[PDB]
Amino acid sequence: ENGYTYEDYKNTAEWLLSHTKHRPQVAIICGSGLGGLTDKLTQAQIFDYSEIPNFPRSTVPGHAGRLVFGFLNGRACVMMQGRFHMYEGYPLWKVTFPVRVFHLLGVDTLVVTNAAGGLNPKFEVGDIMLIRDHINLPGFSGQNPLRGPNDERFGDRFPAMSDAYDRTMRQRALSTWKQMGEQRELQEGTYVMVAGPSFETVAECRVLQKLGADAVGMSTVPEVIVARHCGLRVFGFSLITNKVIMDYESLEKANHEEVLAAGKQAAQKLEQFVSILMASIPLPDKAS
Amino acid sequence: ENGYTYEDYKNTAEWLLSHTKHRPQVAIICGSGLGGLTDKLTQAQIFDYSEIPNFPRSTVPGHAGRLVFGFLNGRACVMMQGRFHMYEGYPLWKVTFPVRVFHLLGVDTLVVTNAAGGLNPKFEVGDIMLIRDHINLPGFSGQNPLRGPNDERFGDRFPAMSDAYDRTMRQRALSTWKQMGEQRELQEGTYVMVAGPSFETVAECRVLQKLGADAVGMSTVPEVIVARHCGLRVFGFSLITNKVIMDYESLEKANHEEVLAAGKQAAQKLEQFVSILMASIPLPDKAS
Amino acid sequence: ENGYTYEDYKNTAEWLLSHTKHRPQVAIICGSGLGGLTDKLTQAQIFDYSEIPNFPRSTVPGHAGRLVFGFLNGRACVMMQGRFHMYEGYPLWKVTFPVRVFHLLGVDTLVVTNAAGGLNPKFEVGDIMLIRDHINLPGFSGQNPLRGPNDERFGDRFPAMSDAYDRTMRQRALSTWKQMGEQRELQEGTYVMVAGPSFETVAECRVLQKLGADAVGMSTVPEVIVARHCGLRVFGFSLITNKVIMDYESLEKANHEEVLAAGKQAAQKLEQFVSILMASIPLPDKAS
Ligand SMILES: O=c1[nH]cnc2c([C@@H]3N[C@H](CO)[C@@H](O)[C@H]3O)c[nH]c12
Ligand SMILES: O=c1[nH]cnc2c([C@@H]3N[C@H](CO)[C@@H](O)[C@H]3O)c[nH]c12
Ligand SMILES: O=c1[nH]cnc2c([C@@H]3N[C@H](CO)[C@@H](O)[C@H]3O)c[nH]c12
User: Fold this and answer.
1) How far does residue C217's CA lie from ligand 3's centre (Å)?
2) Which ligand is nearest to the CA of B193?
3) Which member of A82, A205, A286, B51 lies 3.0 to 4.6 Å from A65 by CB, making a disulfide possible if both were Cys?
4) In which residues is phosphate bound (chains A, B, C)?
């Protein structure tokens, strides 16, 4: 939590607000290859992290990392193209800083997307997995973005996470997928967050799946945790980029280079699905 | 380990000693809702962390956190009302600082108490679980209070922990419980330490139980580790405050608010049990 | 990764090179009790960490920790007698610093040796386990030596580790062992890295084996990770020093003191095996 003071977040939200006529309701954190979602915004207004007052800049990828305000399928959004990861060096209170400010911007929902490895055998690369749960490996050890002294202005000391991924939004999504006439089913599973940048060995791959994880990635979990601490409605997707877990013959490993496809149709389909799902995010106007 | 120098601990123990006529033999670290145990001390002398020379102050809860010297059922004690946790921001060498000083005070036994979630289905909220073992999740990753350069004046480089929770004291306790005429049995199990302040998701809850943990909490393990490194006799209890692990329907989750009961009878019963157990802690006077 | 700049490593390799006529091809990191391997070098040239420009000094054991250049069974080597461990306080980018410099020295292979606990029941103390895989517990949580901003000059952002331990070198080794006429077989397994200096409890011992680890230690994994990031050929051995995992009666625990044997025949045999294996490390001269 530390590093930043409540006023820090307030000065950043206040600056954004005074700089964009936009008042975001939905915050979207695009995983790798999912940045083109920003292409769908109307009335887009871009802010390079760089420009925003206390916003962590990108460790190299700034030339990808930006904040885009606009409208997506009826919702006022703010998208984070190029999220921060623990592995780049950002302590978790920098990684999740955007979230805390989105909260002060007025954002009430956060849709997190990521590129993950398929641990569930059922999964196929290209698959989209609705996140129904997560295992926060960094959090178990101390790397919980909430670590440090708690600010009741954002939330409780011990926020529950057993209900992090909105059930309703997960039902809607599933329904949206069905009604889309999408044949291949919307997969659902537990995302296990792993830190380090290096990729998993077959042995680690096996602990991850025996732990009950369906997809492994290096992000999402921190942002979710602080979003939920904030009280935001959270739900997200995982784009399965590679498959993992076998030393029967572990030579080629379909290594994430499938990021070429992240600049392809699967990514595109997730972006579309996410865009259609805006219609399922309750308007703050009671929309009932 | 670092942050503090051996002389730091010595200056703190020396100050306490020169400030209390008391010479503690037993150190008791009260978990949440177990602070009323201090109410049982005779000849109580209170020290707010604040007042003690190198003692970490509380991140907000100072208004709960204090050190009380006194006598409990025949033993000269020093109780820590309101222990420190990793999640509040304290590096582990601050969390476990008290222990190192209790050691220099002359303390030879440490009874650790905590409020934990029931992972073992057998457990019921209100249950008291004698800690027979622990899984130090933060320790596996690097968060071991002993990390840093070792002081042979406190202990070895590689202290064993396979025998952390005194078997004798665990037998006595079990016997004390039986002889107390207590019907509901004294549960015994492995306490899994988890760091982060946010609560466990059903998926994490499942890794914890498949890992063989019976109770999950966010403390105890560090203090135990350094107590044992010090050579102190350690044994402890876990007050089961909530139950955990099911998404069959994971809406209400009996969230720790059962801390109301921590200001209730279950807490009270653990406090009493702990007090009766003083009679089972060998006097340094050879007491044979 | 941070703490050091690319130029740091370059200034250290450059200094070593300008200080030793030696041009190492093989780097050997000796685990505990395996330092006598340095006794096998011809044309040995010793450098105390202390003397090398940006080289982390030892937290106490400097009086053991040194870098020895020489020739071992046909290969130009550089040995690290007394490696660094997370538990001594070294952040992982100090622990693995040697590796990055060995790389700039021209080293293309790294043989890592360690002393580990036997989790696989098949193992017997004294046994040598060829590392076929690893589970990086510290890495899952954030302690990955690669954490921080990536230097493409050393390697990729997301290096794969599924193929860390050279299969060929693991075949050769196995063959070398067979041809040595060694009766007791060369064990092979997954090494699980655990951080903290304190030893495992029976409960932790059980999570480690249910996780599929065969041997537990507190090193190797970081060095391997950065070696592989560097592109070096990595393979290694684990000398089983103690056995672990049972509370049926967990009193004496064959605690690592078997390090007496680390100054004995088992250690000696690993040192010999490692020395014979030099003949199996491809010469850079295309050696075909
Ligand atoms: O197999 C995998 N393990 C861990 N992370 C990833 C990813 C995620 N996608 C991004 C590109 O690989 C990267 O930031 C990482 O978090 C794809 N496949 C895997
Ligand atoms: O389900 C649980 N998971 C992790 N910790 C706790 C606790 C412990 N009790 C205190 C109040 O919930 C808090 O400091 C935490 O360490 C009670 N229930 C749980
Ligand atoms: O049972 C064990 N658990 C963890 N490490 C070790 C070791 C390793 N050997 C060294 C001496 O015990 C020490 O640095 C540690 O990493 C031997 N046995 C065990």
Assistant:
1) 5
2) 2
3) A82
4) 32, 63, 83-85, 115, 219
What phi and psi values does residue B148 have, to the nearest 5 degrees?
115, -175
Measure the CA–CA gap between A165 and A113, rounded to whole angstroms: 12
- What are the tokens at B239? 């007050």
User: What SS3 state is found at C108?
Assistant: coil
Contact C274, B186 (CB under 8 A): no
Which chain A residues are within 8 Å of B250, Cβ to Cβ? 162-163
Structure tokens of B136? 């130090």
A63 annotated as a binding-site residue: yes
Pocket-forming residues, ligand 2, beta carbon under 6 Å: A 158; B 32, 85, 115-117, 194, 199-200, 216-219, 241-242, 244, 256, 259
Interhelix angle A167-179/A265-276, nearest 10 degrees: 120
- Report the C-alpha gap between B45 and B41 in whole angstroms: 9
8 A C-beta contact, residue B250 and residue B271: no
Question: To the nearest whole angstrom, how far is the Cα of B253 from the nearest Cα of chain C?
Answer: 26
DSSP secondary structure string for all residues of A88-133? GT--HHHHTHHHHHHHHHT--EEEEEEEEEE-STT--TT-EEEEEE
Which residues in chain B are contacts of C87 at CB distance < 8 A? Answer: 144, 146-147
H or E element at residue C134: strand C128-136
Distance CA A182, CA A175 (A): 10
Reference A164, options C135, B247, C190; nearest CA is B247
Burial class (CB in 10 A: 0-12, 13-18, 19+), C100: buried
A233 is in an annotated binding site: no
Rounded to the nearest angstrom, the minimum Cα separation between C248 and chain B is: 12
Eight-state DSSP code of residue B165? B
CA distances from C67 to C27, C99, C239 (A): 10, 12, 21
| Helix, strand, coil % in chain C, rounded to nearest 5 | 35, 25, 40
> Which residue segments constitute the domains of chain C, with CATH numbers given?
1-288 (3.40.50.1580)
Residue C201 has its nearest CB partner, among B133, B143, B210, at B133
Q: How far apart are the first and last CA of chain B?
A: 36
CB A174, CB A129: distance < 8 Å: no
Q: Which residues pair with residue A47 across a beta bridge?
A: A67
Q: Do C59 and B149 touch (CB under 8 A)?
A: yes
Distance CA A163, CA C154 (A): 42
DSSP notation for B195-231: -SSSPPPHHHHHHHHHTT-SEEESSSHHHHHHHHHHT
Interface contact flag, C142 A138, Cβ < 8 Å = yes
Q: Are strands B75-81 and B26-30 parallel, antiparallel or unpaired?
A: parallel
Q: How far apart are the first and last CA of chain A?
A: 36
| Resolution of the model in angstroms | 2.6
Q: In whole angstroms, give the CA distance from residue B202 to residue C94.
A: 37
| CB of C83 closer than 6 angstroms to any ligand 3 atom | no
Please tell me the distance from the alpha carbon of residue C106 to that of residue C97, in angstroms, as a whole number. Answer: 15
What's chain B's length in residues? 288
Residues of C in contact with A90 (CB under 8 A): none
Cβ A147–B60 below 8 Å, yes or no? Answer: no
Q: How far is the CA of B116 from the centre of ligand 2 (A)?
A: 5
Query: Atom 17 of ligand 3 has which residue's CA nearest to it?
Result: C116
Q: Which atom of ligand 1 is nearest to the CA of A256?
A: 12
